[model samples]
Target: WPAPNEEQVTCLKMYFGHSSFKPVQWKVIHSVLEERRDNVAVMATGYGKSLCFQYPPVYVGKIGLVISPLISLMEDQVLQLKMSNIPACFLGSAQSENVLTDIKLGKYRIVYVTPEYCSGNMGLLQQLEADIGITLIAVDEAHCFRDSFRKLGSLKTALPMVPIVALTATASSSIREDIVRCLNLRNPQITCTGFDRPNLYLEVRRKTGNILQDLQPFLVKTSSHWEFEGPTIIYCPSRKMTQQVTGELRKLNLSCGTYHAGMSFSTRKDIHHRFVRDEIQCVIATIAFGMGINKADIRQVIHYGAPKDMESYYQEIGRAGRDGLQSSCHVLWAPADINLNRHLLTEIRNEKFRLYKLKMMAKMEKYLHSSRCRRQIILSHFEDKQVQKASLGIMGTEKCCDNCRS
Candidate 1:
């Protein structure tokens, strides 16, 4: 058992003070402190993955390093920590020279940065490991490291002796193996609570013409009884679809906005803030809107277009029902969507890369058409055993496909 320190106690108080820790937070923390083993934590969204490292940093007596994928996510985390009166900062390409200098000087207890920034700066890594009291290295969106071999060479070259912890909402069996190989983690303790969200009702509708007609049934079904409220998210597969879906939803007189990489950074930021404030009732966006969105009151999530893969689909759908309240996860798919993907795939210059992307797209198509328990199918992707029907009552009842449902 890991001995609790004063900082740990204070952090526990803060944990209860800010928000409750889900079932696995303390278990993961104990593994981090006592066993001193690296971890790959695959908890659902709203499970408080941040606390796995956040609370421990207070006790570790050294700076905690977090490598995240998105600058927006880093900014949001820093803002939240600041609101809680925790000292944190981030280093990014957009930072001024003076700001970067201060971060190097160890002015903050928690420092968040992108993998690109770390991979590009060997001198900075050497300095951080030497001068800063570095105890833990947290990799948010750990799945990205699976591609690190292609993107950043070897993980050993990234951080030599640091005890690492990786966090992600989605990881398949293959991707998990890739992550372990890429990171060179020695007998890493893997904790996966699985991808079963009981409070979320999952459904899929076939798209006949376009997303507008496709969403009509959902809007009608949901609006009929007036059973739910709060913000809803509609995820499109591309920027063009994002705009198209936003226009279609507006035609129905629903308050909605479009967010994607095609928009200016400032516009995206404005839309994100407005959505968080509940100024907008709905948002139509691509995957770009995901990593930074932490609003817990999202009552519904709809996919206006098919996702690229099962991992992407799982992560996107996982955004819903985060508050442990009732929510819906709906999808609109069609056979033609595969043709649409094939057309997009044909534009790629590299055949090998294009084939890989096409394979991921095909996997998503299979997931949509699978006749298995939706929850069990998703959980199995992470290499987790299916829970017996009786025990599954605790997580929310299962909604299987046509066969099981019948």
Candidate 2:
């Protein structure tokens, strides 16, 4: 294995266009790129999460395997890597068997694929292990394994020997434990940067009888502040809400569009590209829009409806303020929203596990309604040491909550 040196670090800076590593990135890269140990990086969004694994692959001789959850994300990452002149390829249903065969021959330095491809194709995994010499296995959106509601448990059964790095923007205490167990990592060092984003002002508004009526007032109030400078994301709990909120925002004359699983692949791709290029200001979307969005300058993330759990809420909120700039994370809370989420939960066939997830959801609701420091509440969920108020002062002057303003 190759070690990361000054030369390699300099090359990384040049390639990624960064002056230095963010919190825990250097530690992660040093461990994996030089010391050859599997690591779990639970960093927040925009904290240079990709560099943790990406830098090691460039220095190490063997191919790096990145198992991601979204095809759109994989495609975007492959394009970025290619532009940086890194040799990378992707294997998906869209690709032919011959293309994947070439990949198994070690023609690429990095390979990206969905978890489904890796677990379903035993021959491909065996070939990569035997011929390509896969040095590291990178799992993005790793919280799904412990999500219990999602029941993603294949990486454990397959690929036991390969060093695994599990990465995610949002993971609570239980989710982190699940990741460690699922990956079966050896002496893994878990590095969680925690869920406190001081630059972002958190706000939750209880919905009035009409959501659009309540939303319009806030949009109008904040319209002048919106310079149309960066991207904004509005998450609806369902496809119906996506359309309704998108139409409502349009009525307010905001440049916005909608994205959901119901849309065709090509349409989603075009909308994703446009949003990336900043051609659109806001994206009205569902949970389907959650994974693998790498946009850095998202100025705001608005949840028009409540997420099913705090883990999902943290992940969605983490999307904002990635550029180290001030951003807003707002959620509209309502009893009806909870009832709607409960109704949708019944639609899922996994009744027993879904009931457990509902319990977790209630815990998150309690947190959101609490009067304590929001950061402390979220960190406690992950069993992290309580962040002192002094440290909190350094991060931000205010920890906004309903009580603080009301």
Candidate 3:
């Protein structure tokens, strides 16, 4: 067993400078630290999931390895850890030779690397294990085991003693099972908190041919002044839609920019910098934009059309209301968007992948037309038991969905 809860929490206060953990946060940490068990945590975004893996290294005075998905995300996380006086670094395409030498010297307490990078550098990891010892392995965004990430199954055989923790915000029951099997987690404890974000009011509006006219009511307060209420994000389905939406918003006298994969690295960085500094009030982009964003004061998230599945939709909307203030998420969807998504799925040649997406798309359509409470539908889709106990529009005793308000 580990130390008492009071002493552990004191270490938390001294290191992370936080008063207390969120709901079920301590439970996940204790399972890892005390029992030395592997874990799978499915907490919502902004619920401080990073702290769970971050605490163990400080508590035990051992280094931990974090398998991140994106290089930008790894850099952002490393920067935040260093700013808080923690020793952390990431090995990416830009790192110099000295960083690897330092990592081998056991100078850093936490190390972040991509799944592909780690899979290719097994000899380096074996050396680290022999020299300094790796106490835990953390897989961020653990639901994305689609390609090279599946090779992570080798970790169990390679470093047989180290505990593993898989963390993500959105994973269905089937996806959760897949994560366990793919990572070869040995009877890991599953910690999944309720996915209800009471601060966000959900609404779905029908999409007309002219999106500019459709969004006028939400974008403009008074007819004379064309200003948004606060920092907002509009998610488009494609790169062209992002450009078209940005142009339309600018025509309405609102300052905004387009962000997509087609843009150059400098252009995308400039847009992100402007948005973070409060220079730009709105950003129109595809799903490629928000994975690296850490802004907390965003007031709105509008989906110009339906996303591919419920998991992606929930992950996107979870970006809003990060500061615990009231916010809104609007989905402007049409039946045509479903057809468009279906048509796009034809590009995938693999039968298994294509059929899996088809099923997910059908669920998205069910959500768009469901006559019941929207929150209930979402909870039920994830198979969360909280929806069964508390029934009538309960996002903290308010009408939480468009159907309830209607």
Summing lDDT over every window of 10 consecutive residues in candidate 3, give the lowest-scoring window.
388-397
| Candidate 1 segments exceeding 4 Å error | 1-9, 15-24, 42-44, 92-106, 119-121, 141-159, 168-170, 210-212, 220-229, 342-373, 379-391, 394-406
Colliding pairs, model 1:
none
Score each candidate by Cα lDDT.
0.70, 0.69, 0.78
Measured with C-alpha atoms, the lDDT of residue 242 in candidate 3 is 90
List the candidate 2 regions with Cα displacement exceeding 4 Å: 1-4, 92-107, 119-132, 141-161, 168-187, 220-230, 342-359, 368-376, 379-391, 394-402
Superior by lDDT: candidate 2 or candidate 3: 3
lDDT of 3 by residue, 176-255 (tens): 67678778889898887656776777888888889788788786666686877888999999999998888888888887
Question: On residues 18-81, what C-alpha lDDT tens digit does candidate 2 reach at each position?
Answer: 7666547777777765556778877665456777767666766568888775666677788888
Q: Candidate 3, after superposition: displacement of residue 233 in Å?
A: 0.8
Question: Could you estimate the TM-score for every candidate?
Answer: 0.79, 0.80, 0.88
Query: Quick one: ranking by TM-score, best first?
Result: 3, 2, 1
lDDT of 3: 0.78
